[PDB]
Amino acid sequence: AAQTNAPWGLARISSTSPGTSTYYYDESAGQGSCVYVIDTGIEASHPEFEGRAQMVKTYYYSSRDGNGHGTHCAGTVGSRTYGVAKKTQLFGVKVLDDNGSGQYSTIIAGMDFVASDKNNRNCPKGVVASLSLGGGYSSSVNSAAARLQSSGVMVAVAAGNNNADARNYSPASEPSVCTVGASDRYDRRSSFSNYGSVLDIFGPGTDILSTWIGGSTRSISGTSMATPHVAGLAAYLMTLGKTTAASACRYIADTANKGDLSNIPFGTVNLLAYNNYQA
Ligand SMILES: O=C(O)[C@H](O)c1cccc(Cl)c1
Numbered sequence: 001a002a003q004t005n006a007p008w009g010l011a012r013i014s015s016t017s018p019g020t021s022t023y024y025y026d027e028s029a030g031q032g033s034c035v036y037v038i039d040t041g042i043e044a045s046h047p048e049f050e051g052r053a054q055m056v057k058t059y060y061y062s063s064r065d066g067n068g069h070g071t072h073c074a075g076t077v078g079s080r081t082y083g084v085a086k087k088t089q090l091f092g093v094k095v096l097d098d099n100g101s102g103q104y105s106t107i108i109a110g111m112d113f114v115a116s117d118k119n120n121r122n123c124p125k126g127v128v129a130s131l132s133l134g135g136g137y138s139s140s141v142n143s144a145a146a147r148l149q150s151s152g153v154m155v156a157v158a159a160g161n162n163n164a165d166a167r168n169y170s171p172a173s174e175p176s177v178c179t180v181g182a183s184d185r186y187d188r189r190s191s192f193s194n195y196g197s198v199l200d201i202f203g204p205g206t207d208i209l210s211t212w213i214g215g216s217t218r219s220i221s222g223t224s225m226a227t228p229h230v231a232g233l234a235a236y237l238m239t240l241g242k243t244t245a246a247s248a249c250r251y252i253a254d255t256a257n258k259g260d261l262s263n264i265p266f267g268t269v270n271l272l273a274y275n276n277y278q279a
Pocket of ligand 1: 132133134135136158159160161162169170171172223224
């Protein structure tokens with residue numbers, strides 16, 4: 001399948017070169033997979049989600065996304081226009097309040113929730129969790145992400161936005177999950193992207209168009225935007241049968257575009273997520 005006039009990041013993940021604007025992908029499109037978006041919520045009523053999104057858990061007075069961040073990330077995973085995996089099922093877990101803030105204890109509870117809740121969902125092709133959040137190093141936060149991964153969920157986490165080594169942030173620094181840095185449309189490391197040995201992969205993160213609350217759209221930047229590209233890619237590849245939740249991060253690294261990004265510090269992987277789709 002070909003989506004013309006796609007957001008640059010979608011075009012990038014199906015291309016061997018920057019500077020194109022059509023997204024190419026297998027029509028299976030993540031059907032039969034599920035992606036949890038652990039964030040500020042999801043505006044599931046947005047037409048872009050086509051009934052495939054739902055809130056399953058909140059720790060606050062509402063499950064609605066009063067911020068936009070979680071809706072944007074969910075749109076990059078799986079919206080019809082802005083999403084990588086256009087037929088996946090999206091499940092929202094609201095661990096962040098409407099200002100985008102949340103306590104680590106709530107975030108940990110949300111990760112353990114997903115590890116159990118997947119047993120209440122139909123995801124025959126596999127389960128992914130996208131965590132566009134983080135803070136300072138916490139062994140307990142890292143352990144929660146490790147448990148979620150161990151339980152059979154492909155965990156993708158944002159590297160962080162401090163232009164610093166991600167070893168000092170969580171869950172970014174957990175070795176067993178997929179830690180995602182950000183790139184721009186010219187294949188440069190995004191100016192804010194964290195780096196370091198703990199990164200596994202880069203995805204599009206600067207000037208990413210996606211869904212927003214109020215049935216709207218907007219372009220924003222962050223490792224929060226790169227992470228759902230990788231989460232959606234994992235769901236797509238699992239539906240194709242090319243990989244599994246346990247192996248998807250390594251498979252994405254194996255099959256990435258290699259050596260194409262600029263301003264990658266010595267010792268950080270130079271790997272850009274790529275679907276290897278041959279139309
Ligand atoms: O840069 C920040 O805001 C935080 O350090 C951070 C760390 C890890 C992941 C995210 Cl999305 C944010």
